[PDB]
Amino acid sequence: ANALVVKVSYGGVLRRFRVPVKANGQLDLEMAGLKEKIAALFNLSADAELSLTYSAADGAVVALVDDNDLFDVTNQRLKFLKINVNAG
Ligand SMILES: [Cl-]
Question: Domain range spanning residue 61?
Answer without folding.
Answer: 1-88
